[PDB]
RNA sequence: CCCGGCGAGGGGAGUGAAAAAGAACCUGAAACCGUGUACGUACAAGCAGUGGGAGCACGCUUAGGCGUGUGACUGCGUACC
């Protein structure tokens, strides 16, 4: 029984070359060059599911600092004062109130000042 | 055991150990697989690098030309060269133990009885070697795919069944495991049942 | 009018009539769920802050869907070391609709 | 019982080893031989 | 029948189930080379992707947001054997 490789081999190259569309030059036309590109894009995506959680917390913290310094307090003292008041709202919600509701954010700052005093 | 008869409502007595066993599937599978291995021919071959036509000259010199090194035009890497692990004629038959071959027969016959695929008669014959004659008899008994085991070979029964591909005729001495399974229904005369037990025992 | 509550290890800020996607809940696709652990309620310049929960605050919702999210691919590769491996993933969610906020 | 309803016993049909057929199989490339010796060569090894 | 050198090549008419079956004639993949449309691009430094993300075009069918193409700007990042 002789076995020919033509039909299976062709379908296996087309799967890789479809994941590589939008790339520049030979990276979307040639199998040897495109296979390496698809491998590297999967390595980066695994790593960047970790860095995504770092880049967003860092952004919330910089916006709470800016809105706190405008009410006469810093980020360090604001966060310590909320722990002593037993307020369990987290960074993501706080950076959202600071943009869309500045009246409620001021009420939070007055509660942290009272706890520190 | 006791086997009923359809054409004469008699009773025929047989052995329990030949018709009352349980099914040994692992044993039957081995004997059936070894039967089909014994049907192969095994006739084929290819050419190695030593059997392709051509001389033993070295295509170009070892060093200096800027090409990969070559030693033979009959290399299995070149187009029109030899086959690396070429085939030879071979024999595919397997050995089956005598007690194992006979044990698998007894569990095939024992299971045909449980599923009602075996029926016993006294006589089965036709007057003349005519296909139309045998075809009529089968339709009365409501049989389409059938294997007929008879005690002694009949010249007229053999000839009348030749042109019907769904009907096969044997004698007791010529039973094989595969055709007992492949046919929908099995018809054995009383004389055939007597000899089969004797050869199995 | 909005409230903040926690569910599934995360926190959410919602308004009435909104549809929110959470982690998988053990509730049938038609029933109503209840959230009694509310962190704050803001009602247009009247603000209530929980220490850590607002007394008497509760949020009512209705389960509207179950399903699995989009598929992601895991790719591991160690160059020059003869090693490679791949995997796929698909995460379960639950959608609810906010029907009533009360303090 | 039919010709397409018979199976063998469990544990009697171990599959053979196939060397040099990719990374995932666990036997690709060198095929279980190691690196660069007399014992790794075609025909290599010492007499009894 | 028409253009053309009483050419090569082509457009009609006709045959045929089919001519994109027309003799360089079954099917007709990939590398490679073109014409058309949408978006980007002439103050900008590097394995050319990946995480975030506006604007534009287009289809939306509860008018809601969704799908598809492009990708200004920005964090991280020196191919494979
Ligand atoms: Mg063939
Ligand atoms: Mg391949
Ligand atoms: Mg191309
Ligand atoms: Mg292409
Ligand atoms: Mg290739
Ligand atoms: Mg020759
Ligand atoms: Mg010589
Ligand atoms: Mg010579
Ligand atoms: Mg040859
Ligand atoms: Mg013998
Ligand atoms: Mg790498
Ligand atoms: Mg290993
Ligand atoms: Mg070994
Ligand atoms: Mg080596
Ligand atoms: Mg060494
Ligand atoms: Mg060594
Ligand atoms: Mg060694
Ligand atoms: Mg080696
Ligand atoms: Mg060697
Ligand atoms: Mg040698
Ligand atoms: Mg002239
Ligand atoms: Mg002409
Ligand atoms: Mg016509
Ligand atoms: Mg044809
Ligand atoms: Mg053609
Ligand atoms: Mg093409
Ligand atoms: Mg434009
Ligand atoms: Mg411009
Ligand atoms: Mg410009
Ligand atoms: Mg400048
Ligand atoms: Mg620079
Ligand atoms: Mg440049
Ligand atoms: Mg750099
Ligand atoms: Mg990007
Ligand atoms: Mg994005
Ligand atoms: Mg624009
Ligand atoms: Mg622009
Ligand atoms: Mg970038
Ligand atoms: Mg960088
Ligand atoms: Mg870099
Ligand atoms: Mg490096
Ligand atoms: Mg490398």
Swiss-Prot record, chain A:
Gene Ontology CC terms, in alphabetical order: ribonucleoprotein complex; ribosome
A GO term, aspect molecular function: rRNA binding
One matching Pfam family: Ribosomal_L20
Top-rank lineage group of the source organism: Bacteria
Entry keyword set: Ribonucleoprotein, Ribosomal protein, RNA-binding, rRNA-binding
Biological process per Gene Ontology, one example term: ribosomal large subunit assembly
PROSITE patterns in the record: RIBOSOMAL_L20
UniProt function note: Binds directly to 23S ribosomal RNA and is necessary for the in vitro assembly process of the 50S ribosomal subunit. It is not involved in the protein synthesizing functions of that subunit.
Protein family membership: Belongs to the bacterial ribosomal protein bL20 family.
Annotated protein name in UniProt: Large ribosomal subunit protein bL20
Organism expressing this protein natively: Escherichia coli O45:K1 (strain S88 / ExPEC)
From Swiss-Prot, chain B:
Name the UniProt record assigns to this protein: Large ribosomal subunit protein uL4
Organism: Escherichia coli O1:K1 / APEC
Chain spans, region Disordered: 44-71
Gene Ontology molecular function: rRNA binding; structural constituent of ribosome
Assembly behavior: Part of the 50S ribosomal subunit.
A single Gene Ontology CC term: ribonucleoprotein complex
Keywords for this protein: Ribonucleoprotein, Ribosomal protein, RNA-binding, rRNA-binding
UniProt-listed NCBIfam families: rplD_bact
Recorded family membership: Belongs to the universal ribosomal protein uL4 family.
Entry-linked InterPro entries: Ribosomal_uL4, Ribosomal_uL4-like, Ribosomal_uL4_dom_sf
GO biological process, one term: translation
Function: One of the primary rRNA binding proteins, this protein initially binds near the 5'-end of the 23S rRNA. It is important during the early stages of 50S assembly. It makes multiple contacts with different domains of the 23S rRNA in the assembled 50S subunit and ribosome. Forms part of the polypeptide exit tunnel.
Domain of life: Bacteria
Pfam families from the UniProt entry: Ribosomal_L4
PANTHER family recorded: 50S RIBOSOMAL PROTEIN L4 (PTHR10746), LARGE RIBOSOMAL SUBUNIT PROTEIN UL4M (PTHR10746:SF6)
